[PDB]
Write an enzyme that holds these catalytic residues in place. Structure first.
Site, PDB file in Angstrom:
ATOM      1  N   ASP B 312       0.822  -1.207   0.000  1.00 16.39           N
ATOM      2  CA  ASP B 312       0.000   0.000   0.000  1.00 16.39           C
ATOM      3  C   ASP B 312       0.859   1.260   0.000  1.00 16.39           C
ATOM      4  O   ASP B 312       0.519   2.249  -0.660  1.00 16.39           O
ATOM      5  CB  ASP B 312      -0.945  -0.006   1.201  1.00 16.39           C
ATOM      6  CG  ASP B 312      -1.988  -1.103   1.115  1.00 16.39           C
ATOM      7  OD1 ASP B 312      -2.321  -1.524  -0.013  1.00 16.39           O
ATOM      8  OD2 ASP B 312      -2.474  -1.544   2.177  1.00 16.39           O
ATOM      9  N   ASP B 361       0.754  36.374  10.057  1.00 13.35           N
ATOM     10  CA  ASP B 361      -0.243  36.304  11.116  1.00 13.35           C
ATOM     11  C   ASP B 361      -0.854  37.693  11.266  1.00 13.35           C
ATOM     12  O   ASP B 361      -0.596  38.591  10.458  1.00 13.35           O
ATOM     13  CB  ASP B 361       0.381  35.783  12.417  1.00 13.35           C
ATOM     14  CG  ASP B 361      -0.641  35.144  13.339  1.00 13.35           C
ATOM     15  OD1 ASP B 361      -1.721  35.736  13.539  1.00 13.35           O
ATOM     16  OD2 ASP B 361      -0.370  34.040  13.856  1.00 13.35           O
ATOM     17  N   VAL B 418      -5.762  29.114   9.912  1.00 13.36           N
ATOM     18  CA  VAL B 418      -6.383  29.969  10.916  1.00 13.36           C
ATOM     19  C   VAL B 418      -7.526  29.209  11.579  1.00 13.36           C
ATOM     20  O   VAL B 418      -7.711  28.010  11.339  1.00 13.36           O
ATOM     21  CB  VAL B 418      -6.871  31.298  10.307  1.00 13.36           C
ATOM     22  CG1 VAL B 418      -5.731  31.997   9.578  1.00 13.36           C
ATOM     23  CG2 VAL B 418      -8.051  31.070   9.375  1.00 13.36           C
ATOM     24  N   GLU B 420     -11.114  27.663  12.863  1.00 12.59           N
ATOM     25  CA  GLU B 420     -12.161  26.927  12.155  1.00 12.59           C
ATOM     26  C   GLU B 420     -13.440  27.757  12.138  1.00 12.59           C
ATOM     27  O   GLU B 420     -14.283  27.661  13.031  1.00 12.59           O
ATOM     28  CB  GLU B 420     -12.395  25.570  12.809  1.00 12.59           C
ATOM     29  CG  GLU B 420     -11.425  24.478  12.382  1.00 12.59           C
ATOM     30  CD  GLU B 420     -11.745  23.915  11.009  1.00 12.59           C
ATOM     31  OE1 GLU B 420     -11.316  24.518  10.002  1.00 12.59           O
ATOM     32  OE2 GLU B 420     -12.435  22.875  10.937  1.00 12.59           O
ATOM     33  N   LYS B 425     -12.410  32.321   7.271  1.00 10.07           N
ATOM     34  CA  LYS B 425     -11.557  31.832   6.193  1.00 10.07           C
ATOM     35  C   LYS B 425     -11.881  32.523   4.874  1.00 10.07           C
ATOM     36  O   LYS B 425     -10.983  32.770   4.060  1.00 10.07           O
ATOM     37  CB  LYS B 425     -11.703  30.316   6.060  1.00 10.07           C
ATOM     38  CG  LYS B 425     -11.085  29.521   7.205  1.00 10.07           C
ATOM     39  CD  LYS B 425     -11.636  28.102   7.245  1.00 10.07           C
ATOM     40  CE  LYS B 425     -10.528  27.064   7.299  1.00 10.07           C
ATOM     41  NZ  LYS B 425      -9.702  27.184   8.528  1.00 10.07           N
ATOM     42  N   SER B 447     -10.277  20.760   9.396  1.00 11.34           N
ATOM     43  CA  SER B 447     -10.524  19.410   9.880  1.00 11.34           C
ATOM     44  C   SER B 447     -11.915  18.904   9.532  1.00 11.34           C
ATOM     45  O   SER B 447     -12.089  17.698   9.324  1.00 11.34           O
ATOM     46  CB  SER B 447     -10.330  19.346  11.398  1.00 11.34           C
ATOM     47  OG  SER B 447      -9.009  19.708  11.761  1.00 11.34           O
ATOM     48  N   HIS B 468      -4.956  19.023   4.669  1.00 15.58           N
ATOM     49  CA  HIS B 468      -5.178  18.772   6.089  1.00 15.58           C
ATOM     50  C   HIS B 468      -3.919  18.160   6.698  1.00 15.58           C
ATOM     51  O   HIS B 468      -3.548  17.029   6.367  1.00 15.58           O
ATOM     52  CB  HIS B 468      -6.385  17.856   6.276  1.00 15.58           C
ATOM     53  CG  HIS B 468      -6.732  17.593   7.708  1.00 15.58           C
ATOM     54  ND1 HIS B 468      -7.363  16.438   8.119  1.00 15.58           N
ATOM     55  CD2 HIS B 468      -6.545  18.337   8.823  1.00 15.58           C
ATOM     56  CE1 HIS B 468      -7.544  16.481   9.427  1.00 15.58           C
ATOM     57  NE2 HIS B 468      -7.057  17.622   9.879  1.00 15.58           N
TER      58      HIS B 468
END
Ligand SMILES: O=C(O)c1cc(S(=O)(=O)O)ccc1F
Ligand SMILES: O=C(O)c1cc(S(=O)(=O)O)ccc1F
Lengths: 399, 726, 397
Positions: B312, B361, B418, B420, B425, B447, B468
């Site tokens: 795999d 940032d 940044v 969630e 976003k 996520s 991710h």
């Protein structure tokens, strides 16, 4: 009180000492292998009714230390209540464990016991445990310690057994062990040793020399010994003897091998409850011995005491099985009790197949259980000599 | 009979010189690497038969390779097909292999291994049979015995010889138990290699120079290994030595402690083969090693691990999930939005590969703290000697902390990390999409939130894609690439190539809520919390997780995922199908999460979760836990707890395969092992099904039968889907 | 059904480990010393009638190898027919030898048997013999091998025995042993050890610390090879952490010593002018999990009571070996044993635990205390390594 019955008796093949097939097999694995065969033969047996596991082991060191009997219980996954005790009575440890298991049943405080022995002399040589006698010159000096080989040479010297006499017995043992293996007498008792994958490792007593000849035996050279002193020490005790005739060689003495044996001993209520069929019955056991310097004439009083205890005489016994530690020991035992030659070690002995110290007693016991069944005879007598001047004997009756 | 043989094209070239030094150059014409296959065994048989036949005219032997590598690996394609009835063939193969090497080792003349490159597994075993090992200190060269990582053991004499060289303890801990790979300098320092040279051209000359010098100086000891001499003393002692016998019983327990009780029989077998082998002669020792090797190959765990970590992993790296036909596009400057644990870790692994990174940032003070994550990482690396001062200075010089969107000029690869939130976003991407290069990849590290929603906040939606990562980014090896329904196949391949460039492993996932890793690890966490609400002991839950093979127990993991975030996911997944018309069946864990939140124990970040957190460290379970959930009122079998957590993830993985979330079981296995830490002995949450083993049996049928046994006792979430039914 | 009787039960003092008085004495010499005492007590005894000598020994190597029971029979000048066999059932080897001697007598094939044990832990430390369950990683890894110290701490954790609780029992043992020694209870049973010149080597149990205070016990520090703690909790998975309460002050001492018991039938006793002191009513053998190791005495005691048709109320004296304090407290808690019936003369925490001999020592300790108190019944039991357990009930005659 309670009668003790032998329900099963099996043994591993005996692997030789030099380039032996069992040298890679841990002693614990030989015993667990036999436990897994007993499981295969009786799958529905409630192992919780097994109250103890008694194993004979003369050298409880290294792989054979730490109560190997208990190790076999835990390693095989037997119930944690099944005990596990090691004992050592030198060469008769295997038979002593069987007798102790029988006496534990006869007392009523034990229902079903596994008994036997284990010895991997290729991995744990004799004397590996040292000994309270060797590491103590004050005791060694007073007890007049003499190794087993010189007692046998002395026995042959006193009784007049010649080099040809002991080699004649060595030849007939290799012959009878060959006949027994050919006839399939050992087919159901000798459980072949297999690895964790199931591959074969050993399926036969590989110490045997079936092509043994009178000429080949006569050419061998005589045998703790090979050092000095022990000959003079033995004659300091037996001062009427002038010279020790060294007749014993590697061909007429017991071979150094690895092996293990298991005997399942229980009461009639135990076998009935578990659907087990009795095969023989412990009629009587006994212990005695003689001088430690001659060392090996101990099975003669132990046999008379067990015959006296069973209410029988030599004529009542169909099969005599005495361990072939040395050829002169058997010829003496035969000469004393006037044993008919065709009733004595009828399937060979330790000279052909080997002598795995701790396990020998239970191996030759299981040899007689199968032979009484094969011949359809009643009684056999199993006896072993012991180092230090002891002796053990047992009488079994086919059921 | 006892032979060196077990049709194939010969793999060894033979050359004897004037002095009598035979040079065996291994060059398998069926591949780019020498591999211990049927062709090798047959050829080394012919060569060793010839070395014995011409013994009178041979003064020394030099083993060399004509490849970029020396020798690396064996026949995994054959080892994986070996059934328990094939144990005889497997045992006889390694016995034949070792009989060849043992003859080479005992020819009565010196043999030297010319190690021009990687000597891994069987390759190092061949060199370990030689009396002198000379390795070229080239780049990419490695040495080690990594058989344990495939659920096997070094069965070509590796276990027997390293124990004879270093002793039971050092050989097991440093070489065997972990399959550690060493660079040629580390190899010389621990004794695996004797001496080093700087170029492969000096190897064979140095090997023949050593053979000539050895014969002149030490004639009686030439071609005789240390363990074939009278008075050989094994380092650290033998098991019968009283010094070693005092600590020897602690070896299985220390191993049992490190493995946390998980079912991994390869290290258990290596340790047994090492100790059992040290109790007997060399030949008896190697035959024992062969039996344990055959015991592993014919077992299921080895087949689980051979499938995952060989077939795999190679299928993934070869581009099995990479769009067909798309070429390579360079990456000149990476732009990371956010300097949290993710953004800082992302900036490190990107700059460590060599990419120029712009770390933005909201404040310069924040971005500088993000780069500090790399500085503190390189600091540990320097004091431990795993990098030079020069390359460390260059690495950090590629990270440019900033607080202006103007410094994203020239960025052709954006990785946003940044908070969630969808409209946050949308705003962060809105003010950088015009500054970056026109072909720039616009990646989001999310996520749960679906990529299709986040993509609408930009114009070039075809270049929007989910990348991710997993924390800690510097050590977690997976990158979950999510494909929104407007994402182009070029953007997919570009992110795919970047993942390999930073030394990580990619899986391509189609857009959906929870993706694959977040969705599956949710079922692992929820099973544990459900057990807590059912009244199971918290200590027994953590024990089940560790003994199942998980890297971190589930309650401890829950404290780090923040139960507050965990509750928000369930609120966002109910209105994702209840607002859609369907139904949402609440999980029993949701009542446990809500009660822990009710008591102000949301997790580790808060300072109190299922564990007590004092002085930054984690100090035991919260004592009020047993009273809160009536712990002890339910005592199921530990194997049920283990199977509840393994089956819940294995079934949610099958759900993902049936919904088109995943497109290959190779992505499912590696994605579950490297993404969320599914136990490696299973070979992955997909291999776990086809290789289940318990009281029922082995295979897909035994899994289904066991999943139904769990459904009867714990709920219908364990009911097997139609896809697994036959 | 021949009944088994105890005619003599003697033992040596227990010499401590560090700078012990018995370190210069071979284990063989300890047994021969006890044999020579039995001759002094009954010089009319016909040693020919002694069928076997059964000695327990946990480490049968070196000075204790080669069937030390047979070495004693030869070195003492006993008849060569008197057998000699060494057995090992870990800590119960001393009591198993006694029980096996009684089972050999009940079977009617042995008439008069010597049983006991010998252990010189200062010369032959435990573990000197090796063993599979420790020195073989295949079976060690499967049976979850754990030292007895950690099983004792795990017991104290499960039962809620604090450090003060176990230390309280340790003080109890030190005080009761000091009283029994001052009270003269051990006068006729502890045979002083002397050298070949008759000079005194030891006449008392060195390991005792009769001035023990609970403040000194609380100062002590609580297997250090690592790994075993996590192995025990992998099986006992409902426990989060093991509270290590056991120290050198609340655990059994490491000492040298030997014990001997003369066991025979009523006919053998009548024939040799021997007065029976007590009768072996029943024996039993059971076990519990080997990872906790020391919980096997509870079912073995429950079994030996049912076999003899008795209950706890029928027993006057309970003697359990003080291997660890929590083992005795757990035992006392389960069977609800009265405090004044339990180890009334102290135990191994004060006097020591000479492995192969302890079972025969506490057996002899009870025979004397029954004759002193004029009480009827005593129950003796020991925990064993590997998870076993043996129990015995004796009745005074
Ligand atoms: O990539 C490979 O072929 C590979 C080989 C081994 S070996 O130890 O068998 O040489 C271990 C891990 C691997 F991934
Ligand atoms: O002390 C706090 O209030 C606090 C709360 C959280 S929360 O995740 O519960 O929102 C996290 C960190 C905190 F320090």
């Amino acid at each position: 009180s309670e009668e003790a019955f032998i329900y099963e008796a099996i043994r591993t093949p005996r692997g030789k000492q030099k380039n032996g097939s069992l040298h890679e097999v841990k002693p614990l694995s030989l015993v667990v292998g036999l436990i897994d065969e007993l499981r295969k033969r009786h799958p529905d047996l409630d192992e919780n009714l097994i109250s103890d596991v008694i194993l004979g082991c003369v050298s409880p060191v290294g792989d054979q230390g730490g109560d190997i009997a208990r190790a076999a219980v835990l390693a095989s996954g037997m119930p944690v209540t099944s005990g596990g005790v090691q004992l050592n009575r030198f060469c008769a440890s295997g038979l002593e464990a069987v007798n102790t298991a029988a006496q534990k049943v006869r007392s009523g405080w034990d229902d079903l016991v596994l008994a036997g022995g284990v010895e991997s002399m290729s991995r744990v040589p004799m004397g590996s445990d040292g000994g309270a006698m060797g590491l103590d010159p004050a005791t060694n000096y007073d007890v007049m310690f003499v190794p087993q080989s010189i007692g046998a040479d002395l026995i042959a010297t006193i009784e007049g057994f010649s080099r040809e006499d002991v080699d004649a017995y060595a030849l007939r043992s290799q012959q009878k062990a060959a006949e027994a293996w050919s006839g399939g007498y050992f087919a159901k008792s000798v459980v072949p040793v297999r690895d964790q994958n199931g591959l074969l490792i050993l399926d036969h007593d590989e110490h045997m020399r079936p092509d043994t000849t009178k000429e080949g035996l006569a050419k061998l050279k005589p045998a703790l010994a090979a050092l000095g002193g022990f000959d003079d020490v033995a004659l300091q005790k037996y001062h009427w003897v002038e010279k020790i005739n060294h007749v014993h060689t590697g061909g007429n003495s017991s071979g150094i091998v690895d092996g293990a044996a298991l005997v399942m001993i229980g009461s009639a209520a135990a076998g009935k409850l578990q659907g087990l069929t009795p095969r023989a019955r412990i009629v009587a056991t006994a212990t005695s011995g003689a001088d430690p310097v001659i060392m090996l004439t101990g099975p003669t009083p132990a046999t008379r005491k067990v015959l006296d205890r069973a209410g029988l005489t030599v004529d009542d016994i169909d099969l005599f099985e005495l361990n072939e530690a040395f050829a002169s020991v058997v010829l003496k035992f035969q000469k004393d009790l006037n044993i008919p030659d065709e009733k004595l070690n009828v399937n060979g002995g330790a000279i052909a197949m080997g002598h795995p110290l701790g396990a020998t007693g239970a191996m030759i016991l299981g040899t007689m259980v199968d032979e009484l069944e094969r011949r359809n005879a009643r009684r056999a007598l199993i006896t072993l000599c012991i180092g230090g001047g002891m002796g053990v004997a047992t009488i079994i009756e086919r059921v | 009979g006892s032979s060196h043989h077990h049709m194939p094209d010969n793999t060894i070239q033979w050359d004897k010189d004037a002095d009598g030094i035979v040079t065996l150059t291994m060059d398998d014409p069926s591949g780019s690497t020498n591999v211990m296959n049927e062709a090798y065994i047959e050829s080394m048989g012919k060569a060793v038969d010839r070395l014995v036949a011409e013994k009178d005219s041979i003064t020394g032997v030099v083993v060399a390779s004509a490849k970029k590598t020396f020798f690396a690996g064996g026949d995994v394609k054959t080892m994986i097909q070996a059934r328990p009835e094939d144990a005889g063939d497997v045992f006889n193969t390694v016995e034949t292999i070792k009989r060849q090497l043992r003859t080479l080792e005992t020819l009565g003349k010196p043999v030297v291994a010319a190690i021009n490159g990687a000597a891994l597994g069987g390759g190092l075993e061949i060199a370990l049979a030689c009396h002198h090992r000379i390795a070229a200190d080239v780049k990419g060269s490695q040495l080690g015995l990594p058989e344990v990582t495939l659920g096997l053991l070094p069965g070509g004499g590796g276990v027997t010889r390293t124990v004879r060289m270093f002793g039971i303890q050092n050989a097991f801990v440093s070489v065997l138990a972990q399959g550690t790979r060493f660079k040629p300098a580390k190899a010389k320092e621990i004794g695996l290699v004797d001496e080093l040279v700087a170029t492969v051209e000096e190897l064979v000359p140095a090997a023949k120079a050593w053979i000539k010098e050895e014969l002149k100086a030490n004639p009686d000891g030439a071609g005789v290994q240390p363990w074939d001499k009278k008075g050989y003393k094994m380092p650290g002692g033998t098991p019968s030595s009283p010094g070693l016998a005092a600590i020897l019983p602690s070896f299985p327990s220390n191993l049992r402690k490190q493995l946390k009780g998980a079912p991994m029989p390869a290290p258990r077998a290596i340790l047994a083969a090492a100790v059992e082998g040290a109790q007997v002669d060399f030949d008896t020792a190697s035959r024992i090693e062969s039996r344990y090797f055959a015991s592993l190959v014919t077992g299921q765990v080895a087949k689980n691990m051979m499938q995952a970590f060989f077939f795999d992993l190679q299928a993934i790296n070869a581009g099995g999930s990479r769009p067909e036909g798309i070429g390579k596009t360079p990456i000149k400057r990476i732009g990371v939005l956010g300097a949290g644990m993710m953004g800082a870790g992302i900036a490190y692994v990107s700059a460590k590969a060599g990419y120029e990174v712009v770390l933005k940032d909201v404040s310069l003070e924040a971005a500088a703290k993000g780069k500090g994550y790399s500085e503190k990482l390189e600091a540990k690396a320097l004091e431990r000697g795993r990098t030079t001062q020069e390359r460390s200075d260059a690495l950090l010089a590629r990270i440019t902390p900033t607080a202006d969107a103007a410094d994203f000029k020239g960025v052709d690869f954006v990785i946003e990390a940044v908070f969630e939130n969808q409209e946050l976003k949308h705003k962060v991407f809105g003010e950088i999409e015009d500054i970056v290069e026109p072909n720039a990849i616009l990646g989001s590290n999310t996520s749960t939130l679906p990529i299709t929603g986040l993509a609408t906040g930009v114009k070039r939606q075809e270049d929007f894609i989910g990348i991710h990562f997993f924390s800690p980014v510097d050590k977690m090896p997976l990158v979950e690439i999510i494909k929104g329904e407007k994402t182009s196949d070029e953007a997919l391949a570009r992110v795919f190539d970047y993942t390999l460039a930073i030394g990580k492993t990619p899986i391509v996932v189609n857009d959906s809520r929870g993706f694959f890793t977040s969705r599956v690890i949710g079922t692992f966490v929820n099973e544990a919390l459900a057990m807590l609400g059912e009244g199971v002991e918290p200590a027994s839950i953590e024990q089940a997780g560790s003994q199942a093979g998980y890297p971190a127990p589930p309650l401890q993991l829950s404290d780090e995922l923040n139960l507050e975030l965990m509750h928000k996911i369930a609120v966002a997944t109910r209105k994702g199908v209840e607002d859609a018309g369907g139904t949402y069946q609440p999980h029993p864990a949701e009542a446990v999460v809500e009660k822990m939140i009710e008591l102000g124990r949301s997790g580790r970040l808060k300072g109190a979760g299922f564990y007590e957190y004092a002085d930054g460290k984690r100090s035991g379970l919260w004592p009020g836990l047993r009273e809160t959930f009536k712990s002890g009122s339910s005592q199921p079998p530990l194997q049920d707890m283990i199977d509840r957590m393994l089956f819940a993830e294995a079934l949610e993985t099958q759900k993902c395969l049936d919904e088109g979330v995943l497109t290959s079981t190779a992505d499912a296995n590696i994605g579950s092992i490297m993404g969320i830490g599914f136990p490696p002995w299973t070979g992955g949450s997909a291999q776990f099904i086809v290789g289940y083993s318990g009281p029922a049996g082995t295979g897909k049928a035994a899994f289904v039968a066991r999943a139904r046994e769990l459904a009867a006792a714990y709920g219908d979430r364990f009911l097997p889907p139609e896809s697994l039914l036959s």
